[PDB]
Design an enzyme around this catalytic site. Structure first.
Site, PDB file in Angstrom:
ATOM      1  N   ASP A  57       5.752   1.104  -1.260  1.00 23.04           N
ATOM      2  CA  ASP A  57       4.316   1.361  -1.158  1.00 23.04           C
ATOM      3  C   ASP A  57       3.952   2.853  -1.186  1.00 23.04           C
ATOM      4  O   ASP A  57       4.247   3.592  -0.242  1.00 23.04           O
ATOM      5  CB  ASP A  57       3.774   0.700   0.108  1.00 23.04           C
ATOM      6  CG  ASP A  57       2.274   0.614   0.122  1.00 23.04           C
ATOM      7  OD1 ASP A  57       1.699  -0.038  -0.777  1.00 23.04           O
ATOM      8  OD2 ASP A  57       1.675   1.187   1.052  1.00 23.04           O
ATOM      9  N   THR A  90      -2.056   2.659  -5.303  1.00 22.14           N
ATOM     10  CA  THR A  90      -2.037   3.974  -4.673  1.00 22.14           C
ATOM     11  C   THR A  90      -1.072   4.907  -5.391  1.00 22.14           C
ATOM     12  O   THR A  90      -1.349   6.098  -5.546  1.00 22.14           O
ATOM     13  CB  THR A  90      -1.669   3.920  -3.188  1.00 22.14           C
ATOM     14  OG1 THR A  90      -0.289   3.565  -3.053  1.00 22.14           O
ATOM     15  CG2 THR A  90      -2.552   2.916  -2.452  1.00 22.14           C
ATOM     16  N   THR A  91       0.055   4.370  -5.842  1.00 22.33           N
ATOM     17  CA  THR A  91       0.991   5.174  -6.617  1.00 22.33           C
ATOM     18  C   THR A  91       0.363   5.653  -7.932  1.00 22.33           C
ATOM     19  O   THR A  91       0.485   6.837  -8.307  1.00 22.33           O
ATOM     20  CB  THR A  91       2.289   4.411  -6.900  1.00 22.33           C
ATOM     21  OG1 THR A  91       3.013   4.233  -5.672  1.00 22.33           O
ATOM     22  CG2 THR A  91       3.147   5.182  -7.889  1.00 22.33           C
ATOM     23  N   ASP A 383      -1.188  -5.930  -0.452  1.00 27.77           N
ATOM     24  CA  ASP A 383      -1.623  -5.510  -1.783  1.00 27.77           C
ATOM     25  C   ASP A 383      -2.375  -6.672  -2.447  1.00 27.77           C
ATOM     26  O   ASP A 383      -3.465  -6.509  -2.995  1.00 27.77           O
ATOM     27  CB  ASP A 383      -0.427  -5.116  -2.684  1.00 27.77           C
ATOM     28  CG  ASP A 383       0.330  -3.851  -2.207  1.00 27.77           C
ATOM     29  OD1 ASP A 383      -0.222  -3.025  -1.436  1.00 27.77           O
ATOM     30  OD2 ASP A 383       1.501  -3.688  -2.638  1.00 27.77           O
TER      31      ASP A 383
HETATM   32  N1  LIG Z   1       4.757  -7.525 -15.510  1.00 28.29           N
HETATM   33  C1  LIG Z   1       4.401  -6.236 -15.664  1.00 28.29           C
HETATM   34  N2  LIG Z   1       4.701  -5.556 -16.794  1.00 28.29           N
HETATM   35  C2  LIG Z   1       4.340  -4.265 -16.945  1.00 28.29           C
HETATM   36  N3  LIG Z   1       3.668  -3.559 -16.010  1.00 28.29           N
HETATM   37  C3  LIG Z   1       3.307  -4.133 -14.836  1.00 28.29           C
HETATM   38  C4  LIG Z   1       3.665  -5.536 -14.589  1.00 28.29           C
HETATM   39  N4  LIG Z   1       3.199  -5.843 -13.365  1.00 28.29           N
HETATM   40  C5  LIG Z   1       2.592  -4.728 -12.868  1.00 28.29           C
HETATM   41  N5  LIG Z   1       2.666  -3.710 -13.747  1.00 28.29           N
HETATM   42  C6  LIG Z   1       2.122  -2.338 -13.606  1.00 28.29           C
HETATM   43  O1  LIG Z   1       2.659  -1.582 -12.514  1.00 28.29           O
HETATM   44  C7  LIG Z   1       1.643  -0.684 -12.055  1.00 28.29           C
HETATM   45  C8  LIG Z   1       1.465  -0.842 -10.549  1.00 28.29           C
HETATM   46  O2  LIG Z   1       2.776  -0.748  -9.997  1.00 28.29           O
HETATM   47  P1  LIG Z   1       3.016  -0.496  -8.432  1.00 28.29           P
HETATM   48  O3  LIG Z   1       4.483  -0.179  -8.297  1.00 28.29           O
HETATM   49  O4  LIG Z   1       2.429  -1.621  -7.617  1.00 28.29           O
HETATM   50  O5  LIG Z   1       2.143   0.859  -8.218  1.00 28.29           O
HETATM   51  P2  LIG Z   1       0.719   1.066  -7.457  1.00 28.29           P
HETATM   52  O6  LIG Z   1       1.094   1.502  -6.048  1.00 28.29           O
HETATM   53  O7  LIG Z   1       0.065   2.187  -8.231  1.00 28.29           O
HETATM   54  O8  LIG Z   1      -0.021  -0.259  -7.590  1.00 28.29           O
HETATM   55  C9  LIG Z   1       0.365  -1.023 -12.800  1.00 28.29           C
HETATM   56  O9  LIG Z   1       0.175  -0.065 -13.848  1.00 28.29           O
HETATM   57  C10 LIG Z   1       0.616  -2.378 -13.421  1.00 28.29           C
HETATM   58  O10 LIG Z   1      -0.049  -2.444 -14.684  1.00 28.29           O
HETATM   59 MG   LIG Z   2       0.794  -2.330  -6.689  1.00 27.89          MG
END
Ligand SMILES: Nc1ncnc2c1ncn2[C@@H]1O[C@H](COP(=O)(O)OP(=O)(O)O)[C@@H](O)[C@H]1O
Ligand SMILES: [Mg+2]
Ligand SMILES: Nc1ncnc2c1ncn2[C@@H]1O[C@H](COP(=O)(O)OP(=O)(O)O)[C@@H](O)[C@H]1O
Ligand SMILES: Nc1ncnc2c1ncn2[C@@H]1O[C@H](COP(=O)(O)OP(=O)(O)O)[C@@H](O)[C@H]1O
Ligand SMILES: [Mg+2]
Ligand SMILES: [Mg+2]
Lengths: 516, 516, 516, 47
Positions: A57, A90-91, A383
């Site tokens: 996170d 958030t990332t 989330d």
């Molecule tokens: N199946 C998937 N294939 C490609 N990208 C994905 C998939 N699932 C989620 N994402 C991408 O991962 C990113 C969010 O990742 P995450 O590690 O939860 O970071 P954050 O804390 O920013 O939400 C988003 O850009 C989302 O589009």
């Molecule tokens: Mg996320």
């Protein structure tokens, strides 16, 4: 002899100020970057007390590090706001902000004035918000298939292995339950409870609440079906007057007359509670030990000194009124629950109030084999509740996997064509910054970002698919929407707006003056 | 169990090592950047003893700061090498190297692998060298006009004020006079002497040398015209044997017989010196006080214990031969000079050996009002001697003012088209890096670098004008060749090759391990 | 009661000792891993003095990071011997060693006794030395095209950019020239001089030597064609008896009679040197100030106090004899050189003795823009010189790119099939270890090692291309022998034997006792 | 990288643990041994 400004201070001016801020941002951005998306990895953070946190996170990682650097603190704010307004991405927001600073450096190193960079970023950010509206797809707040994809995508972002369909279904049912009569979701109306157990798959949704209380007397029923619940915040003790009042006794006989009078009103308090029909009671204050007995005789389940937070949640779940005067307890103040049982869970005794029909607060019971395993599942659950609620409130979504950023990037470059002169450089810069997301998705996936980015950019050119994104698993470019990889519009709009506003604020700084 | 690598060490890997070097490089470039060009400014460096240097000279600044950072030290080497091979453009070399590092960072941020950028850089440099050859004009080792423009340009680079016609002309004559049989120039044949005086305009060229000595006996002439000069490597003292020897005297009379024989050996040494036709004499070692009188009685001027370095140059200047045995001396071993005079310069007593007919060493006597004022004139005279030296040896020049870099830049971009895929980005980055010179020139001139570039760049396009560049003064794009703003080919070829090789070396680093 | 073993000691036994050693080994292996192959990256090592070392050279890195851990020291020794016996493949040897420790741990963790692991390892190694012999190709000691590939391949391992066809040809010419009558190649006969300059391409081969000295008088010619070179180890001064001797003078006239006899003893020493036919003289001790004259008056170039190290190399190059007595100097004792010239290089004046006819010593003059860049080219040259020497001495070579390792490993598994006991697990493990090379080559190239290993193995199976290997530059499995990627048999046989013997030694340790 | 078990501790394994206990046991037995029986002797303990 002597100096004007304090002798006890560091100071960084011009290019030095710009560099230390930009650098500080970029470094913060790079810290969480490796956690982005499905193929992202986790940090293990340890504080000075030796307590550990293992999370994917973004905002959690950033808060748990003791970041002291001033420009870094500004970027952490980007994350805290994303957590607050959206609950996810958030990332993304931090990484986008970091990219914006980096891209800004290359313009400042051509001697583009900072206000012009700022002007450009601002123009680009606004256009981006206009573009996001046309990019988003509309959805109904009742579209469960779609809400479930929203939750799946979110949980996947914390690693595919947690993205259970069961879990996502539970989550959607839970947010759906607490939607209010104006169509808003308050994420606090979903109590989160963490209890070790056999497996993460044991995580369940409780139509009701969990209270950490044992029933006041063992003579009371451990179990009661189709219960009629009474919530009191007044103490079931002998009522004393607010005015200073002392008794005076002169007659030996009358000694028992006062004692008896006290216990006769207690017996009258219980009698009043039974009269309302209630067979289950939760009281905020205490309960005179005699009333406990009297309650027990009538077979009424009662728990004492229940914390305010629980009371307020109980009322929300069963439709009861937290009553403040015993006399004023009528049977329309009684909440209704299918099952109220005292039970042990992981060795802890607790009262389960469950199987309510139309509950306004519910409980996610999160299970797992170990504390820290449970802890991260809960963060994932948080989330998903975030983005599900966002979708229910906004009715707008976008495709994931970098597809929305690429489309957005591609449209902003077109926009840059019609900007005259030097501000144009900044607008292109802003456009190019957005691709840090699709590139970061691919890096973490071990793929080659440069070629991937050419492929995705191409599937977007001239009436192509705005939903075209890289699929980190198969390594191909696909229709992310047809793959169910979707996320609330609010995640992109908040993340970009936050990124733009904080970097614009940092880019205006030409002088840092630190004390001590 | 203990660690492998000593726990007494800091380590920087991957991105971190990369940022460390790249950053240390840029910072070192940025310290000297404000000196670049005719409108550059000077540094005042103070050391730990309170000694002070004020200069515009690139490599001097870098040497005089005590830089500890390992990457920084690698770039300082670029400056050192430019000084040794060329004597000018030290700041150019380093500022180009810094820019190559900065342009390389944009590539590494896109996941272009280091080995690829290195490949592209190496390609671009090789091509730059090839282009530099077609770009250069041929000139003759004896073209006073062009040589004078070469010197003038060098000295302007340290402020238009220092660039007096008188000074460049003196220097061209100085260097011209020490050119040898093979057409080579030895900077060391041109002696620099620094004496305070009325004005910097008092600086003069001496067809001869200054010797920090007084004539041994005041009874000797202190002025000699059309002098015949003897140079001796042996001392004019009584000669003893290498094999240990001792005199035994048993006869009282035999005292004076020995004293008088030693006294006669001296009279003979002098009498031999007389016969050669000599009237001035420089002895590398000692002269017996008694021999000094005999020399005086003969009207022969003589200095004793001459620094061997002085002897070596007296020889070079007058055509004398340093003789190691008085008996071997003959009129053919004598040198010639129009004037040998003992006189005072700013209160110091010295012997001038001047007005020599075809000296193979000479003396730049640098004058100025104060020691530090003189130092900077000196440093400016060294840059000039260096580049006139290069022009004589190479017979190839290029126009200056940033014109050549722009031309290269423009042309390398044309080259980059033929490059396939990804190396291309590096090649184009190399092209872009050279524009740092014209950019820095203009920013130091208070001009707007961005629009200036657009103008100069335009003047080079569509088979335009390789010589076009910005005149820091008029603020307009002009033909620098017509303006006499020219420099040796070797300045650019060394600078660029140095910057390319050291950054290439630094870009290949992915692990930094530092001890203590 | 008072304690037997000292109380300062640290002790590790059984499992703990094994893991301590095995870990320390792997860690050492891992620190040079990232440098292996054409896509390898360099390390920057700083010491407690601020001195810097940038290199790709395995043993150099290991030697310069002052490693304390005992187990690790044992592994450095592997690198040091690769360097002594071969000159290249130091990283390969260390990396294989580390891998063997690693595979040993998987066996130890199944309670396979260490002696068994040792026993299987020894057998696999012995079998590998027999396989290697059949795997090599025969080659001519004078097959320039092949040697040049050998050199080209060595240089590429330190990065593609340093791989100059020109450099390789020079190196082959250099090694070929010092090969003695027996056919052995002494690295020390090829002297390495390092001098800053215009570029790395300015590196040349001198059939002769460079002497760090100037001629003793300017009167001597600065350049002589087809020179006759005398080498005198005795001093050209007045000879003194070993038995204590002293002159007694009693006649004032017989004072000069001694000086004159010493002056005639010098004049004669010189006359005898001239009668040799010599016009260039290198003397190891001093040369009387006066004899220096007589030498110039006879037009003889002479250098004094030349170091014994140079006399020996001068003699090796020119065919001269170091004479201890001017008296017995004959025309036969003189060496011959096409050109002896004193010229400046990087502004330092030195004497070049070049264009020799049959030099048995030669000089690689290495040029680069900066000191630290030159250093790395020099090591590249050291490596190539090593492996060219190995090819000439041995006449056997193998294909590079990890191809020979894959063959060797596949054949060793065949060998393991017909072995019974737990021993078999250790042999099959030794086989698997070899693949650490191809794997590491691919990994450093951003490639996927698992599938690439799958493909390379396949191209080797069922007769069978032994020369098949992964070309890091294309990403395809190619025929390395036709691509010219070859190396001496001795690189592999030494590396493997080194890795086997030291890890076998380490695997026998069950107890570490360290003091202090 | 740091240790698992706290670096602030002494450990005794295999034979060593065995000798440690066995020895500490015997010594404790041997201090009281001279008291045994009618002809045993006394201790004077001072705190
Ligand atoms: N199946 C998937 N294939 C490609 N990208 C994905 C998939 N699932 C989620 N994402 C991408 O991962 C990113 C969010 O990742 P995450 O590690 O939860 O970071 P954050 O804390 O920013 O939400 C988003 O850009 C989302 O589009
Ligand atoms: Mg996320
Ligand atoms: N009159 C001029 N107009 C424009 N540029 C000039 C002029 N004279 C010199 N320059 C430029 O200034 C640069 C060299 O400046 P200088 O401060 O001496 O740095 P360096 O130490 O690199 O030689 C070169 O590009 C040179 O062409
Ligand atoms: N052109 C090439 N293609 C593939 N592999 C190569 C090539 N050139 C050299 N190699 C391999 O590089 C390895 C040598 O790596 P190097 O960096 O020299 O470390 P060292 O020789 O010190 O072990 C050898 O396995 C050799 O086969
Ligand atoms: Mg200059
Ligand atoms: Mg090698």
């Amino acid at each position: 002899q002597p100096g004007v400004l304090p002798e006890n201070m560091k100071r960084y001016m011009g290019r030095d100020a710009q560099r230390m801020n930009i650098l500080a941002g970029r470094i913060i951005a790079e810290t969480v970057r490796s956690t982005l998306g499905p193929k992202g990895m986790d940090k293990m953070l340890v504080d000075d007390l030796g307590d550990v946190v293992v999370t994917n996170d973004g905002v959690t990682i950033l808060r748990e590090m003791s970041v002291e650097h001033p420009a870094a603190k500004m970027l952490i704010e980007v994350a805290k706001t994303q957590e607050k307004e959206v609950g996810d991405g958030t990332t993304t927001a931090v990484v986008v902000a970091g990219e914006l600073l980096r891209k800004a450096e290359e313009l400042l190193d051509q001697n583009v004035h900072p206000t012009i960079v700022v002007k450009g970023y601002q123009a680009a950010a606004q256009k981006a918000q206009e573009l996001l509206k046309t990019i988003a797809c509309e959805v109904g707040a009742q579209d469960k298939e779609i809400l479930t994809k929203i939750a799946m995508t979110s949980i996947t972002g914390k690693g595919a292995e947690k993205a259970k369909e069961k879990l996502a279904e539970i989550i959607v049912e839970a947010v759906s339950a607490v939607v209010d009569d104006e169509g808003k979701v308050d994420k606090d109306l979903i109590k989160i409870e963490k209890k070790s157990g056999a497996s993460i798959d044991d995580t369940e949704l409780i139509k009701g609440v969990l209270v950490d209380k044992e029933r006041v007397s063992a003579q009371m029923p451990k179990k009661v079906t189709d219960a009629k619940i009474a919530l009191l915040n007044c103490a079931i003790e002998i009522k004393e007057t607010e005015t200073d009042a002392e008794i005076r006794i002169t007659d030996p006989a009358k000694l028992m007359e006062f004692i008896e009078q006290e216990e006769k009103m207690l017996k009258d308090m219980v009698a009043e509670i039974k009269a309302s029909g209630a067979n289950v009671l939760f009281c905020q204050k205490g309960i005179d030990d005699l009333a406990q007995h009297y309650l027990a005789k009538e077979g009424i389940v009662a728990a004492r000194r229940v914390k305010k937070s629980d009371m307020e949640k109980l009322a929300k779940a069963t439709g009861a009124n937290v009553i403040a005067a015993i006399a004023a307890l009528s049977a329309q103040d009684l909440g209704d629950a299918g099952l109220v049982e005292e039970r042990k869970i992981s060795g802890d005794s607790m009262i389960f109030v469950e199987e309510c029909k139309h509950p306004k607060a519910v409980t996610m019971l999160i299970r797992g084999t170990t504390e820290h395993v449970i802890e991260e599942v809960a963060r994932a659950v948080d989330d998903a509740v975030g983005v599900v609620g966002c979708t229910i409130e906004d009715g707008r979504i976008v495709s994931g996997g970098g597809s929305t950023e690429v489309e957005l990037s591609m449209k902003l470059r077109e926009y840059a064509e019609g900007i005259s002169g030097r501000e144009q450089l900044a607008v292109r810069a802003f456009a190019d910054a957005l691709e840090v997301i699709p590139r970061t998705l691919a890096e973490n996936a071990g793929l080659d970002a440069i070629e991937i980015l050419v492929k995705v950019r191409a599937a977007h050119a001239s009436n192509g698919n705005k939903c075209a994104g890289l699929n980190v698993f198969t390594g191909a470019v696909e229709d992310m929407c047809e793959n169910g990889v979707v996320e609330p519009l609010r995640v992109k709009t908040q993340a970009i707006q936050s990124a733009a506003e904080s970097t614009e604020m940092l880019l205006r700084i030409d002088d840092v003056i630190a004390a001590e």
